[PDB]
Subunit: 104 residues, 3 copies
């Protein structure tokens, strides 16, 4: 496997809005984070979103989380019902353990 002795990888599963996905992807690339992206849909709104799977060494988790925050952070937008302020953007991130990482 590719993990040095005593170190650990994590799997980041980040669910972000489609409007922020290209900017996140560009920033992950710029910071040399590898990603795989999935076109997904939310259970509540049933609208398209984007899920990123990023395998990262534990020592770069805080950095990836800051990239995701800077690009996909929650913010307000005025909309008209049927002008009110609503939350848009935002990221939901799971950090999961990885036992091994291989490249063939």
């Amino acid at each position: 496997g590719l993990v040095p002795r005593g170190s650990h990888m994590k799997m980041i599963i980040a669910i972000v809005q489609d409007q922020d996905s290209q900017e996140l992807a560009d920033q992950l690339v710029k910071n040399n984070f590898r990603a795989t992206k999935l076109a997904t849909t939310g259970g509540f709104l049933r609208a398209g979103n984007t899920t990123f799977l990023c395998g990262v060494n534990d020592d770069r988790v805080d950095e990836i989380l800051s990239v995701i925050n800077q690009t996909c952070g929650n913010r307000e937008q005025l909309v008209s019902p049927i002008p009110v302020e609503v939350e848009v953007g935002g990221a939901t991130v799971f950090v999961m353990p990885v036992d091994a990482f291989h490249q063939f």
Copy 2:
């Protein structure tokens, strides 16, 4: 930071279900305040469409989410054509989560 209180644990549920049951599962998850993200997937053996749900849940609600999945997507008998067939079925993985964040 992270959304998990000290000493508690989250789990990630990966549920692979049939396409015909996916809308009822999604409705029931919503009704019970479970969040989900869904993926259109295909099976390795039959190469036919199915649906994969990713649900991050607190450990204390795992049994509850499993029961919702079972009730809505469990394997069962159905008359068609009148012939009896097996329909539905869910495969579920419960996986550990180190941290959970919202930004």
Copy 3:
């Protein structure tokens, strides 16, 4: 209530492979009785299609599944431009429980 015998452990294999190798990997998984669910994905760098396989496997068959992936997708590098793109990237992840309903 799960499918995992007492004292044993399941793992989730997440294998990201190129679309050109996907069908042959799928056939070999099937032939060796490995279950897989496939996801149509795209790479973060090249933004081009690839395939992600999720395979829940008992720990005692992890080395075998890795050797299937290697035999089918390994030594399969190609240079491309939007860059070495490998045969397979595989994560082995822990699973607490496994259920069929």
